[PDB]
Amino acid sequence: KPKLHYFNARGRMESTRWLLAAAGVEFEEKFIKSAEDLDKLRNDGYLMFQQVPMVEIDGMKLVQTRAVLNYIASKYNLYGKDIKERALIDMYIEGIADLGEMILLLPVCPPEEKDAKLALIKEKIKNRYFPAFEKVLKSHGQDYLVGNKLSRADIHLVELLYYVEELDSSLISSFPLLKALKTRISNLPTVKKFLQPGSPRKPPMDEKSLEEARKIFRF
Amino acid sequence: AEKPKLHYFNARGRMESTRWLLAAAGVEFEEKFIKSAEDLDKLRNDGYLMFQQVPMVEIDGMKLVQTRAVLNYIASKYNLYGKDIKERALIDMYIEGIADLGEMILLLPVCPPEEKDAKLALIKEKIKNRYFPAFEKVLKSHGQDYLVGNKLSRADIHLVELLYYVEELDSSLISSFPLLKALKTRISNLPTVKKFLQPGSPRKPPMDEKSLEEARKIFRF
Numbered sequence: 238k239p240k241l242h243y244f245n246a247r248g249r250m251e252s253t254r255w256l257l258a259a260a261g262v263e264f265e266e267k268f269i270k271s272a273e274d275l276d277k278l279r280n281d282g283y284l285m286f287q288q289v290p291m292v293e294i295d296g297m298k299l300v301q302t303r304a305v306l307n308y309i310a311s312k313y314n315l316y317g318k319d320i321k322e323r324a325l326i327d328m329y330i331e332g333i334a335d336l337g338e339m340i341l342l343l344p345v346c347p348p349e350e351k352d353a354k355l356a357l358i359k360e361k362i363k364n365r366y367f368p369a370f371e372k373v374l375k376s377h378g379q380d381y382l383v384g385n386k387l388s389r390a391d392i393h394l395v396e397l398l399y400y401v402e403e404l405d406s407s408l409i410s411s412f413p414l415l416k417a418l419k420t421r422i423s424n425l426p427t428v429k430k431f432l433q434p435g436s437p438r439k440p441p442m443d444e445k446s447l448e449e450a451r452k453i454f455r456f
Numbered sequence: 457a458e459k460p461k462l463h464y465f466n467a468r469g470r471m472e473s474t475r476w477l478l479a480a481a482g483v484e485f486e487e488k489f490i491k492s493a494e495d496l497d498k499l500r501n502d503g504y505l506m507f508q509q510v511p512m513v514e515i516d517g518m519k520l521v522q523t524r525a526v527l528n529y530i531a532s533k534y535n536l537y538g539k540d541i542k543e544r545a546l547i548d549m550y551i552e553g554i555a556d557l558g559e560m561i562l563l564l565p566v567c568p569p570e571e572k573d574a575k576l577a578l579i580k581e582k583i584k585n586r587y588f589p590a591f592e593k594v595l596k597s598h599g600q601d602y603l604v605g606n607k608l609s610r611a612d613i614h615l616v617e618l619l620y621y622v623e624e625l626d627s628s629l630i631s632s633f634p635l636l637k638a639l640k641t642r643i644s645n646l647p648t649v650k651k652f653l654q655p656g657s658p659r660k661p662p663m664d665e666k667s668l669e670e671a672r673k674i675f676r677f
């Protein structure tokens with residue numbers, strides 16, 4: 238089993254739990270709770286850059302998020318059929334991580350920039366991202382983002398549509414094909430199971446989890 | 457068919473690694489330099505930008521945006537992404553550490569004047585103690601001339617590129633990392649990269665204040 242090393246939070250390991258889950262892979266977590274929990278990993282050389290996410294899979298100690306994602310996605314057939322499909326996928330999931338980054342790091346934001354930053358995430362989701370994934374679905378009419386078969390593009394988009402809902406549920410309201418997608422993916426057996434309570438899907442990041450972040454990562 | 461066509465403004469910024477990668481692959485490409493907010497609104501209005509942003513690269517009938525979509529595609533097409541999935545994973549780990557440092561250096565010129573000095577000192581710490589030791593370590597681990605699978609890959613082109621920006625920052629940083637020195641020489645010495653390093657190629661100069669203002673004027677920031 239893949240073993241995921243992170244603290245017990247969404248952070249930069251969430252899209253990996255979803256991709257693994259969506260692919261039917263069961264995995265272990267090992268939760269770092271302390272700065273010295275992290276230092277242990279560092280000292281045992283388990284971390285190429287002294288950072289996590291790290292994931293033990295197939296004898297490798299893979300750090301860097303995209304390293305983990307790209308590897309899962311190919312291994313489990315979720316990276317399209319050819320390089321032209323990977324390229325469309327990549328283009329999509331990169332627009333998505335760019336928005337996912339903005340939202341991953343709102344709680345770390347200096348508090349005086351927080352208002353200006355929400356407003357602009359909302360504005361980008363309305364004007365920039367959503368219309369772009371709506372154009373895609375509308376262009377081919379198909380159930381999936383690419384090559385008419387499930388891929389990680391569908392996993393990462395739907396995940397982000399969950400966070401966009403937590404932010405403001407009005408936002409997706411005029412992107413009906415996104416709504417349709419959100420639904421269909423969420424009713425895929427493995428994702429439905431992942432979205433159920435007691436799964437390893439993790440909650441929004443509250444306060445103490447943030448404070449648990451600063452302590453472990455020393456920031 | 458058609459040379460790939462790169463769409464950016466006339467600066468390093470987010471298009472430089474692509475320029476590097478395509479040259480190292482010995483692919484001839486065209487550039488179209490955005491000079492103004494108008495030129496960029498035109499690409500927006502013509503539908504050419506999936507997120508209304510550049511880099512964009514027209515290649516193989518696609519309008520690829522997002523540096524990493526473009527990179528991955530070029531890396532794979534020209535066999536510079538390793539020979540399998542386990543290899544692509546080590547390439548991705550390395551080049552993502554590289555991009556983390558690259559981002560830090562790319563964006564330093566945008567940093568507020570009050571932060572710039574603290575930030576640069578932490579770039580220099582991270583280079584000496586985090587990034588460089590991890591790449592020396594890789595090289596030491598196998599003694600081979602390339603970072604992965606013992607043939608040339610984007611892992612080496614990106615790292616070397618970053619060795620040249622780290623050098624501009626402070627040539628003294630790489631000094632306790634001999635194997636990195638050797639990489640940089642050797643890679644710089646491949647025909648394709650050597651030719652790209654020569655005067656009058658598309659390689660771009662470090663961004664001065666004026667280019668930063670054109671960055672300002674164009675992207676509206």
Ligand SMILES: CCCCCCSC[C@H](NC(=O)CC[C@H]([NH3+])C(=O)O)C(=O)NCC(=O)O
Nearest residue numbers: 248249287288289290300301302341450454
């Ligand atoms: C909402 C914020 C989430 C919590 C903090 C950020 S993730 C923890 C952090 N890891 C990284 O930033 C890795 C970044 C890397 N690009 C990746 O995607 O793996 C770390 O080990 N930091 C330790 C260090 O770099 O010293």
Ligand SMILES: CCCCCCSC[C@H](NC(=O)CC[C@H]([NH3+])C(=O)O)C(=O)NCC(=O)O
Nearest residue numbers: 335469470509510511522523563566671675
């Ligand atoms: C110090 C400045 C260096 C220049 C960096 C900005 S490059 C221009 C910017 N592009 C992007 O942020 C694309 C980001 C994307 N994740 C990528 O990597 O391609 C843009 O078109 N922005 C226009 C917009 O967002 O509307």
